[PDB]
Amino acid sequence: EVIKEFMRFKEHMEGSVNGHEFEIEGEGEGRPYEGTQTARLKVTKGGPLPFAWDILSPQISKAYVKHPADIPDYLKLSFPEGFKWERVMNFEDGGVVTVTQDSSLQDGEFIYKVKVRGTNFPSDGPVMQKKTMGWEASSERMYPEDGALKGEMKMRLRLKDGGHYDAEVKTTYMAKKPVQLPGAYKTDTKLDITSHNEDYTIVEQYERNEGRHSTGA
């Protein structure tokens, strides 16, 4: 078994949001079977970011999703080779974020390599004015389609406000070899910024994910 009850990961991200290029690196740890993790991130190029850290947080780790025994854990079964995923987030004010990601395993540790592109965010919007306050918990509908695992979800950013700034999200997760794909089900996810001191140039996150059968949805 290559996936231990404790697993670290490291992450390299590059991207650009409305033409502002950046790099971020991170190192993290978690309990893959328990559904838990934490990481430390920093902006290694292009810092301080012109834009909310929040649009980045969901793109900085689904090997740590807790599954019941009878839902196959496709993304853990995918190691040691790993999996890749491609996402599109469509925000209500016209901004879009697209992401491509490789995840593999080297030296006992998960290794994430992430390319993010944000575009068409309004100069005066809550993302570019850095006015957001973190994501409410969400549930991603997971379902096998065209030989891959797909998820969709509505994700909701809190605003320095009381209301919410909303994204429609679609992700295709595809293992590098054809391991059992699950039937459809839900993943409940809560992502927290736990420490942001620095300039949101050093940031720590905590995330809890749990797989469950649906009712339902």
PDB file of C-alpha atoms in Angstrom:
ATOM      1  CA  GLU A   1       0.000   0.000   0.000  1.00  0.00           C
ATOM      2  CA  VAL A   2       1.607   3.234  -1.132  1.00  0.00           C
ATOM      3  CA  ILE A   3      -0.949   5.478   0.604  1.00  0.00           C
ATOM      4  CA  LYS A   4      -0.246   5.583   4.325  1.00  0.00           C
ATOM      5  CA  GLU A   5      -2.666   6.768   7.060  1.00  0.00           C
ATOM      6  CA  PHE A   6      -0.353   9.840   7.165  1.00  0.00           C
ATOM      7  CA  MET A   7       0.734  11.447   3.855  1.00  0.00           C
ATOM      8  CA  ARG A   8       2.625  14.644   2.988  1.00  0.00           C
ATOM      9  CA  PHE A   9       2.428  16.524  -0.348  1.00  0.00           C
ATOM     10  CA  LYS A  10       4.144  19.250  -2.097  1.00  0.00           C
ATOM     11  CA  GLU A  11       2.755  21.598  -4.610  1.00  0.00           C
ATOM     12  CA  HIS A  12       4.026  23.810  -7.400  1.00  0.00           C
ATOM     13  CA  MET A  13       1.547  26.191  -9.008  1.00  0.00           C
ATOM     14  CA  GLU A  14       1.980  28.687 -11.779  1.00  0.00           C
ATOM     15  CA  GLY A  15      -0.535  30.915 -13.285  1.00  0.00           C
ATOM     16  CA  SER A  16      -1.922  34.278 -14.101  1.00  0.00           C
ATOM     17  CA  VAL A  17      -5.152  36.081 -13.340  1.00  0.00           C
ATOM     18  CA  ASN A  18      -6.008  39.083 -15.593  1.00  0.00           C
ATOM     19  CA  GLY A  19      -2.450  38.956 -16.879  1.00  0.00           C
ATOM     20  CA  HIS A  20      -0.746  39.030 -13.517  1.00  0.00           C
ATOM     21  CA  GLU A  21       1.655  36.131 -13.493  1.00  0.00           C
ATOM     22  CA  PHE A  22       2.597  34.283 -10.288  1.00  0.00           C
ATOM     23  CA  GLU A  23       4.093  31.173  -8.761  1.00  0.00           C
ATOM     24  CA  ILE A  24       3.217  29.484  -5.498  1.00  0.00           C
ATOM     25  CA  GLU A  25       4.722  26.558  -3.698  1.00  0.00           C
ATOM     26  CA  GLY A  26       3.373  24.611  -0.831  1.00  0.00           C
ATOM     27  CA  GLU A  27       4.021  21.738   1.499  1.00  0.00           C
ATOM     28  CA  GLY A  28       1.180  19.952   3.286  1.00  0.00           C
ATOM     29  CA  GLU A  29       0.210  16.855   5.396  1.00  0.00           C
ATOM     30  CA  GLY A  30      -3.019  15.002   6.133  1.00  0.00           C
ATOM     31  CA  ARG A  31      -4.788  11.767   6.842  1.00  0.00           C
ATOM     32  CA  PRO A  32      -5.893  10.430   3.481  1.00  0.00           C
ATOM     33  CA  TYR A  33      -8.542   7.917   4.980  1.00  0.00           C
ATOM     34  CA  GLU A  34      -9.789  10.355   7.550  1.00  0.00           C
ATOM     35  CA  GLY A  35     -10.599  13.094   4.958  1.00  0.00           C
ATOM     36  CA  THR A  36      -8.105  15.723   6.497  1.00  0.00           C
ATOM     37  CA  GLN A  37      -5.362  17.956   5.597  1.00  0.00           C
ATOM     38  CA  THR A  38      -3.423  21.143   6.108  1.00  0.00           C
ATOM     39  CA  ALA A  39      -0.868  23.049   4.089  1.00  0.00           C
ATOM     40  CA  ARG A  40       1.520  26.004   4.130  1.00  0.00           C
ATOM     41  CA  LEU A  41       1.734  28.046   0.881  1.00  0.00           C
ATOM     42  CA  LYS A  42       3.679  30.906  -0.279  1.00  0.00           C
ATOM     43  CA  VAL A  43       3.816  33.227  -3.157  1.00  0.00           C
ATOM     44  CA  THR A  44       7.234  32.736  -4.621  1.00  0.00           C
ATOM     45  CA  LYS A  45       6.825  34.934  -7.726  1.00  0.00           C
ATOM     46  CA  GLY A  46       4.465  37.872  -8.442  1.00  0.00           C
ATOM     47  CA  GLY A  47       3.707  38.502  -4.768  1.00  0.00           C
ATOM     48  CA  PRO A  48       1.666  40.226  -3.223  1.00  0.00           C
ATOM     49  CA  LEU A  49      -1.137  38.998  -5.495  1.00  0.00           C
ATOM     50  CA  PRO A  50      -3.399  41.755  -7.021  1.00  0.00           C
ATOM     51  CA  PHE A  51      -6.409  39.584  -6.361  1.00  0.00           C
ATOM     52  CA  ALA A  52      -8.186  37.531  -3.659  1.00  0.00           C
ATOM     53  CA  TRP A  53      -6.389  34.438  -2.421  1.00  0.00           C
ATOM     54  CA  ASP A  54      -9.815  32.801  -2.319  1.00  0.00           C
ATOM     55  CA  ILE A  55     -10.019  32.100  -6.087  1.00  0.00           C
ATOM     56  CA  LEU A  56      -6.817  30.115  -5.712  1.00  0.00           C
ATOM     57  CA  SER A  57      -7.581  28.118  -2.522  1.00  0.00           C
ATOM     58  CA  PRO A  58      -9.840  25.459  -4.166  1.00  0.00           C
ATOM     59  CA  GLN A  59      -7.129  24.833  -6.818  1.00  0.00           C
ATOM     60  CA  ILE A  60      -4.339  24.263  -4.260  1.00  0.00           C
ATOM     61  CA  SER A  61      -5.990  17.685  -3.307  1.00  0.00           C
ATOM     62  CA  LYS A  62      -8.500  14.800  -3.676  1.00  0.00           C
ATOM     63  CA  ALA A  63      -6.354  11.940  -2.521  1.00  0.00           C
ATOM     64  CA  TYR A  64      -7.495  12.998   1.009  1.00  0.00           C
ATOM     65  CA  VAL A  65     -11.163  12.333   0.678  1.00  0.00           C
ATOM     66  CA  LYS A  66     -12.698   9.995   3.241  1.00  0.00           C
ATOM     67  CA  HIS A  67     -14.728   7.158   1.548  1.00  0.00           C
ATOM     68  CA  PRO A  68     -16.974   4.537   2.855  1.00  0.00           C
ATOM     69  CA  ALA A  69     -15.869   1.005   2.212  1.00  0.00           C
ATOM     70  CA  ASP A  70     -18.332   0.366  -0.510  1.00  0.00           C
ATOM     71  CA  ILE A  71     -17.611   3.432  -2.652  1.00  0.00           C
ATOM     72  CA  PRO A  72     -14.506   2.772  -4.578  1.00  0.00           C
ATOM     73  CA  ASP A  73     -11.844   5.505  -3.865  1.00  0.00           C
ATOM     74  CA  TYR A  74     -10.929   5.983  -7.537  1.00  0.00           C
ATOM     75  CA  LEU A  75      -8.421   8.703  -6.866  1.00  0.00           C
ATOM     76  CA  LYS A  76      -6.483   6.798  -4.225  1.00  0.00           C
ATOM     77  CA  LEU A  77      -6.573   3.533  -6.332  1.00  0.00           C
ATOM     78  CA  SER A  78      -4.903   5.676  -9.082  1.00  0.00           C
ATOM     79  CA  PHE A  79      -1.479   5.731  -7.150  1.00  0.00           C
ATOM     80  CA  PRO A  80       1.366   5.465  -7.319  1.00  0.00           C
ATOM     81  CA  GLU A  81       1.166   6.775 -10.915  1.00  0.00           C
ATOM     82  CA  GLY A  82      -1.531   9.234 -10.011  1.00  0.00           C
ATOM     83  CA  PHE A  83      -4.270  11.190 -11.725  1.00  0.00           C
ATOM     84  CA  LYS A  84      -4.809  14.527 -13.598  1.00  0.00           C
ATOM     85  CA  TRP A  85      -7.810  16.886 -13.570  1.00  0.00           C
ATOM     86  CA  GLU A  86      -9.097  19.921 -15.611  1.00  0.00           C
ATOM     87  CA  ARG A  87     -11.499  22.374 -14.142  1.00  0.00           C
ATOM     88  CA  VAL A  88     -13.538  25.307 -15.223  1.00  0.00           C
ATOM     89  CA  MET A  89     -15.082  27.808 -12.743  1.00  0.00           C
ATOM     90  CA  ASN A  90     -17.548  30.303 -14.013  1.00  0.00           C
ATOM     91  CA  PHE A  91     -18.182  33.236 -11.707  1.00  0.00           C
ATOM     92  CA  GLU A  92     -21.373  35.181 -11.747  1.00  0.00           C
ATOM     93  CA  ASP A  93     -19.625  38.502 -12.719  1.00  0.00           C
ATOM     94  CA  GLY A  94     -17.980  36.982 -15.836  1.00  0.00           C
ATOM     95  CA  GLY A  95     -14.629  35.951 -14.438  1.00  0.00           C
ATOM     96  CA  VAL A  96     -13.520  32.442 -15.266  1.00  0.00           C
ATOM     97  CA  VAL A  97     -10.778  30.359 -13.794  1.00  0.00           C
ATOM     98  CA  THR A  98      -9.454  27.301 -15.639  1.00  0.00           C
ATOM     99  CA  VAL A  99      -7.064  24.795 -14.181  1.00  0.00           C
ATOM    100  CA  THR A 100      -5.049  21.773 -15.224  1.00  0.00           C
ATOM    101  CA  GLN A 101      -3.304  19.599 -12.629  1.00  0.00           C
ATOM    102  CA  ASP A 102      -1.096  16.527 -12.444  1.00  0.00           C
ATOM    103  CA  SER A 103      -0.887  14.540  -9.154  1.00  0.00           C
ATOM    104  CA  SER A 104       1.608  11.732  -8.669  1.00  0.00           C
ATOM    105  CA  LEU A 105       3.708  10.181  -5.894  1.00  0.00           C
ATOM    106  CA  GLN A 106       7.458  10.450  -5.454  1.00  0.00           C
ATOM    107  CA  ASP A 107       9.548   9.681  -2.391  1.00  0.00           C
ATOM    108  CA  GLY A 108       6.519   8.671  -0.364  1.00  0.00           C
ATOM    109  CA  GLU A 109       4.839  12.037  -0.886  1.00  0.00           C
ATOM    110  CA  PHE A 110       2.121  13.325  -3.197  1.00  0.00           C
ATOM    111  CA  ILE A 111       3.388  15.836  -5.778  1.00  0.00           C
ATOM    112  CA  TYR A 112       0.928  18.323  -7.307  1.00  0.00           C
ATOM    113  CA  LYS A 113       1.720  20.424 -10.354  1.00  0.00           C
ATOM    114  CA  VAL A 114      -0.954  23.014 -11.134  1.00  0.00           C
ATOM    115  CA  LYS A 115      -1.515  25.599 -13.962  1.00  0.00           C
ATOM    116  CA  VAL A 116      -4.235  28.212 -13.289  1.00  0.00           C
ATOM    117  CA  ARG A 117      -5.539  30.942 -15.549  1.00  0.00           C
ATOM    118  CA  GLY A 118      -8.023  33.530 -14.393  1.00  0.00           C
ATOM    119  CA  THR A 119      -9.441  35.906 -16.950  1.00  0.00           C
ATOM    120  CA  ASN A 120     -12.168  38.494 -17.423  1.00  0.00           C
ATOM    121  CA  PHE A 121     -12.434  39.483 -13.801  1.00  0.00           C
ATOM    122  CA  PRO A 122     -13.753  43.027 -13.496  1.00  0.00           C
ATOM    123  CA  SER A 123     -11.109  45.515 -12.335  1.00  0.00           C
ATOM    124  CA  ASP A 124     -13.706  46.672  -9.887  1.00  0.00           C
ATOM    125  CA  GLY A 125     -14.963  43.256  -8.833  1.00  0.00           C
ATOM    126  CA  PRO A 126     -14.722  41.466  -5.451  1.00  0.00           C
ATOM    127  CA  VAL A 127     -11.836  39.281  -6.693  1.00  0.00           C
ATOM    128  CA  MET A 128      -9.565  42.117  -7.995  1.00  0.00           C
ATOM    129  CA  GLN A 129     -10.496  44.438  -5.126  1.00  0.00           C
ATOM    130  CA  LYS A 130      -9.615  41.631  -2.661  1.00  0.00           C
ATOM    131  CA  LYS A 131     -13.018  41.758  -0.923  1.00  0.00           C
ATOM    132  CA  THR A 132     -13.807  38.080  -0.285  1.00  0.00           C
ATOM    133  CA  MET A 133     -13.962  36.128   2.998  1.00  0.00           C
ATOM    134  CA  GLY A 134     -13.637  32.425   2.220  1.00  0.00           C
ATOM    135  CA  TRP A 135     -15.818  29.647   0.883  1.00  0.00           C
ATOM    136  CA  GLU A 136     -18.959  28.208   2.445  1.00  0.00           C
ATOM    137  CA  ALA A 137     -19.007  24.406   2.669  1.00  0.00           C
ATOM    138  CA  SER A 138     -20.125  22.696  -0.517  1.00  0.00           C
ATOM    139  CA  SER A 139     -20.998  19.301  -1.911  1.00  0.00           C
ATOM    140  CA  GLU A 140     -19.613  18.134  -5.209  1.00  0.00           C
ATOM    141  CA  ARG A 141     -21.788  15.680  -7.182  1.00  0.00           C
ATOM    142  CA  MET A 142     -19.321  12.907  -8.339  1.00  0.00           C
ATOM    143  CA  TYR A 143     -20.386  10.726 -11.244  1.00  0.00           C
ATOM    144  CA  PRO A 144     -18.533   8.538 -13.794  1.00  0.00           C
ATOM    145  CA  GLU A 145     -18.858   9.809 -17.366  1.00  0.00           C
ATOM    146  CA  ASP A 146     -17.050   8.993 -20.584  1.00  0.00           C
ATOM    147  CA  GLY A 147     -14.515   6.822 -18.699  1.00  0.00           C
ATOM    148  CA  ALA A 148     -13.606   9.573 -16.160  1.00  0.00           C
ATOM    149  CA  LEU A 149     -14.801  10.846 -12.784  1.00  0.00           C
ATOM    150  CA  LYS A 150     -16.564  14.170 -13.053  1.00  0.00           C
ATOM    151  CA  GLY A 151     -17.812  16.561 -10.261  1.00  0.00           C
ATOM    152  CA  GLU A 152     -19.987  19.473 -10.377  1.00  0.00           C
ATOM    153  CA  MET A 153     -20.898  21.951  -7.681  1.00  0.00           C
ATOM    154  CA  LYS A 154     -22.093  25.443  -6.907  1.00  0.00           C
ATOM    155  CA  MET A 155     -19.412  27.099  -4.752  1.00  0.00           C
ATOM    156  CA  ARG A 156     -20.133  30.255  -2.757  1.00  0.00           C
ATOM    157  CA  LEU A 157     -17.681  32.916  -1.687  1.00  0.00           C
ATOM    158  CA  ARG A 158     -18.542  34.982   1.358  1.00  0.00           C
ATOM    159  CA  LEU A 159     -18.280  38.725   0.785  1.00  0.00           C
ATOM    160  CA  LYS A 160     -17.145  41.408   3.243  1.00  0.00           C
ATOM    161  CA  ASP A 161     -20.817  41.900   3.063  1.00  0.00           C
ATOM    162  CA  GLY A 162     -23.178  39.217   4.290  1.00  0.00           C
ATOM    163  CA  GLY A 163     -24.075  37.904   0.883  1.00  0.00           C
ATOM    164  CA  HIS A 164     -22.301  35.679  -1.541  1.00  0.00           C
ATOM    165  CA  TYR A 165     -20.387  35.669  -4.800  1.00  0.00           C
ATOM    166  CA  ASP A 166     -21.082  32.512  -6.747  1.00  0.00           C
ATOM    167  CA  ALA A 167     -19.300  30.062  -9.088  1.00  0.00           C
ATOM    168  CA  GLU A 168     -20.528  27.146 -11.182  1.00  0.00           C
ATOM    169  CA  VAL A 169     -17.843  24.550 -11.291  1.00  0.00           C
ATOM    170  CA  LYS A 170     -17.054  21.447 -13.461  1.00  0.00           C
ATOM    171  CA  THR A 171     -14.048  19.165 -13.058  1.00  0.00           C
ATOM    172  CA  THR A 172     -12.962  16.030 -14.873  1.00  0.00           C
ATOM    173  CA  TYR A 173     -10.661  13.785 -12.797  1.00  0.00           C
ATOM    174  CA  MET A 174      -8.988  11.055 -14.712  1.00  0.00           C
ATOM    175  CA  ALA A 175      -6.714   8.325 -13.279  1.00  0.00           C
ATOM    176  CA  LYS A 176      -3.573   7.520 -15.241  1.00  0.00           C
ATOM    177  CA  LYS A 177      -4.657   3.829 -15.365  1.00  0.00           C
ATOM    178  CA  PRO A 178      -8.303   2.619 -15.605  1.00  0.00           C
ATOM    179  CA  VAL A 179      -9.043   1.838 -11.848  1.00  0.00           C
ATOM    180  CA  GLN A 180     -12.579   1.170 -10.658  1.00  0.00           C
ATOM    181  CA  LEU A 181     -14.721   4.098 -11.177  1.00  0.00           C
ATOM    182  CA  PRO A 182     -17.386   4.643  -8.469  1.00  0.00           C
ATOM    183  CA  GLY A 183     -21.061   5.052  -9.054  1.00  0.00           C
ATOM    184  CA  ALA A 184     -22.412   8.510  -8.473  1.00  0.00           C
ATOM    185  CA  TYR A 185     -22.221  10.027  -4.952  1.00  0.00           C
ATOM    186  CA  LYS A 186     -21.431  13.333  -2.996  1.00  0.00           C
ATOM    187  CA  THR A 187     -18.259  14.794  -1.549  1.00  0.00           C
ATOM    188  CA  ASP A 188     -18.783  17.289   1.260  1.00  0.00           C
ATOM    189  CA  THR A 189     -15.880  19.790   1.492  1.00  0.00           C
ATOM    190  CA  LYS A 190     -15.054  22.598   3.898  1.00  0.00           C
ATOM    191  CA  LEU A 191     -11.949  24.649   3.070  1.00  0.00           C
ATOM    192  CA  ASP A 192     -10.636  27.175   5.593  1.00  0.00           C
ATOM    193  CA  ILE A 193      -7.945  29.773   5.470  1.00  0.00           C
ATOM    194  CA  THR A 194      -6.442  29.157   8.976  1.00  0.00           C
ATOM    195  CA  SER A 195      -3.605  31.698   8.961  1.00  0.00           C
ATOM    196  CA  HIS A 196      -2.912  34.524   6.538  1.00  0.00           C
ATOM    197  CA  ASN A 197      -0.711  36.880   7.891  1.00  0.00           C
ATOM    198  CA  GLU A 198       1.747  37.890   5.214  1.00  0.00           C
ATOM    199  CA  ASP A 199       0.590  39.510   2.566  1.00  0.00           C
ATOM    200  CA  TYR A 200      -1.686  36.886   1.835  1.00  0.00           C
ATOM    201  CA  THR A 201       1.894  36.010   0.570  1.00  0.00           C
ATOM    202  CA  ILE A 202       2.130  33.228   3.242  1.00  0.00           C
ATOM    203  CA  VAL A 203      -1.034  31.396   3.792  1.00  0.00           C
ATOM    204  CA  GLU A 204      -2.159  28.172   5.521  1.00  0.00           C
ATOM    205  CA  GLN A 205      -5.291  26.169   4.644  1.00  0.00           C
ATOM    206  CA  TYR A 206      -7.200  23.361   6.240  1.00  0.00           C
ATOM    207  CA  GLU A 207      -9.592  21.161   4.321  1.00  0.00           C
ATOM    208  CA  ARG A 208     -12.027  18.419   5.247  1.00  0.00           C
ATOM    209  CA  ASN A 209     -13.533  16.151   2.568  1.00  0.00           C
ATOM    210  CA  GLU A 210     -15.947  13.275   2.950  1.00  0.00           C
ATOM    211  CA  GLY A 211     -17.483  10.938   0.439  1.00  0.00           C
ATOM    212  CA  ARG A 212     -21.057   9.780   1.076  1.00  0.00           C
ATOM    213  CA  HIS A 213     -23.847   8.005  -0.607  1.00  0.00           C
ATOM    214  CA  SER A 214     -26.571  10.238  -1.792  1.00  0.00           C
ATOM    215  CA  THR A 215     -30.246  10.069  -1.221  1.00  0.00           C
ATOM    216  CA  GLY A 216     -31.009  11.958  -3.069  1.00  0.00           C
ATOM    217  CA  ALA A 217     -28.507  13.996  -4.395  1.00  0.00           C
TER     218      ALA A 217
END
